[PDB]
């Protein structure tokens, strides 16, 4: 079990907020999960005994796990190298 | 406005086998970087 | 190693204010914090209360919340015990001790500090209430 | 406000003799989505009390390579690989779970 609210604060912006208009008839909604987040527990001791929580909360994360095989470049046509030619005049 | 019908609760479901196949399969990948003789436990975090 | 001492009156009288002091040794009060641990011959140990780098929760037993107090003084570099309205049991001794460790992360209400241990006790304070 | 029970009170064994303890609650010491905080304190006469045993099974440090204690708990156990001659004192078990922080009752150890 769970709960609804309507005003939300996604992307926290203290300054400002939005409210969820109602939706008509009921909603099924199916999906897959792909990912999961962990976050580790503090610097106790040497304990064999690890737990691992679900943290969240960071945007920054979430599409941190799309763009991670990207790269953006910058190319250069210039370039240099010895050979052996002439300029005549 | 009203509501039409009678008056339930939101919920979710998840299947079990596939569910704890898949942490089965992750908690094994964990222990390489920590260790062999690792015992993992998962919480559920507090309020927020 | 870190060695604290307890420090406060030998002979006490009753009905008197008991104000006992633990000698925080080098480790400042910023660092890890202390708590207070309460002997009784006859009978098993008891709790007093806990204290913090900033105070704020300080928890205490219930039982002894309206008589007994807890300060901290970071100038002073020493935490006291306020004690009034003694008991026939109170011919025992005080230990002074702190919390070694810690266990913390990022969901743990946002980064709040847990302490779940006694460090090595205080060598015991020895009190004679009598006439 | 909750009474701990230590079992055995009184506990003989030879030196080279494994000996156990267990210390037991009502109350469930599993805390609020965390671990089971309790502790076991050496009481040796004319010295210092030590903690020995962090939380359920963590060695914090010193000599502890004799004393392993395990277990879910509600009914807490304690075991001793060997018994040494400095094993002479009176032990305690602590419980923290929320409220009080109390301790038990103690259980003295006799040498042959």
């Known amino acids: 079990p769970c709960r609804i609210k309507q005003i939300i604060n996604m992307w926290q912006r203290i300054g400002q907020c939005m409210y969820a208009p109602p939706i008509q008839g009921v909603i099924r909604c199916v999906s897959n999960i792909t990912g999961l987040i962990l976050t580790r527990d503090g610097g106790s001791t040497n304990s064999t005994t690890e737990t691992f929580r679900p943290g969240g909360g960071d945007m920054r994360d979430n599409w941190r796990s799309e763009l991670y095989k990207y790269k953006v470049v910058k190319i250069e046509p210039l370039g240099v190298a010895p050979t052996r030619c002439k300029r005549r005049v | 406005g009203d509501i039409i019908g009678d008056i339930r609760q939101a919920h979710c479901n998840v299947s079990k086998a596939t569910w704890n196949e898949t942490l089965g399969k992750v908690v094994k990948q964990l222990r390489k970087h920590f260790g062999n003789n690792t015992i993992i436990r998962f919480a559920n975090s507090s309020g927020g | 190693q870190v060695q604290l001492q307890e420090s406060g009156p030998g002979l006490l009288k009753p009905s008197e204010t008991l104000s006992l002091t633990c000698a925080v040794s080098g480790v400042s009060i910023t660092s890890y914090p202390w708590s207070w641990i309460r002997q009784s011959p006859g009978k098993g140990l008891e709790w007093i209360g806990r204290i913090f780098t900033v105070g704020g929760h300080t928890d205490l037993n219930p039982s002894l919340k309206s008589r007994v107090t807890i300060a901290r003084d970071s100038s002073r570099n020493q935490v006291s015990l306020i004690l009034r309205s003694v008991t026939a049991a109170d011919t025992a001794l005080y230990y002074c001790?702190?919390?070694?460790?810690?266990?913390?992360?990022?969901?743990?209400?946002?980064?709040?500090?847990?302490?779940?241990?006694?460090?090595?006790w205080g060598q015991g304070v020895a009190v004679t209430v009598s006439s | 406000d909750i009474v701990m029970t230590q079992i055995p009170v009184s506990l003989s064994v030879t030196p080279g003799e494994p000996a156990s303890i267990s210390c037991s609650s009502s109350?469930?010491?599993?805390?609020?989505?965390?671990?089971?905080?309790l502790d076991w304190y050496l009481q040796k006469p004319g010295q210092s009390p030590q903690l020995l045993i962090s939380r359920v099974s963590g060695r914090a440090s010193g000599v502890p390579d004799r004393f392993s204690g395990s277990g879910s708990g509600t009914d807490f156990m304690l075991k001793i690989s060997r018994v040494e001659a400095e094993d002479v004192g009176i032990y305690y078990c602590m419980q923290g779970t929320q409220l009080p922080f109390s301790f038990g009752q103690g259980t003295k150890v006799e040498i042959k």
């Open positions: 001790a702190r919390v070694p460790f810690y266990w913390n992360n990022k969901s743990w209400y946002g980064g709040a500090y847990q302490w779940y241990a006694l460090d090595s």
């Open positions: 109350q469930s010491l599993q805390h609020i989505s965390g671990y089971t905080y």
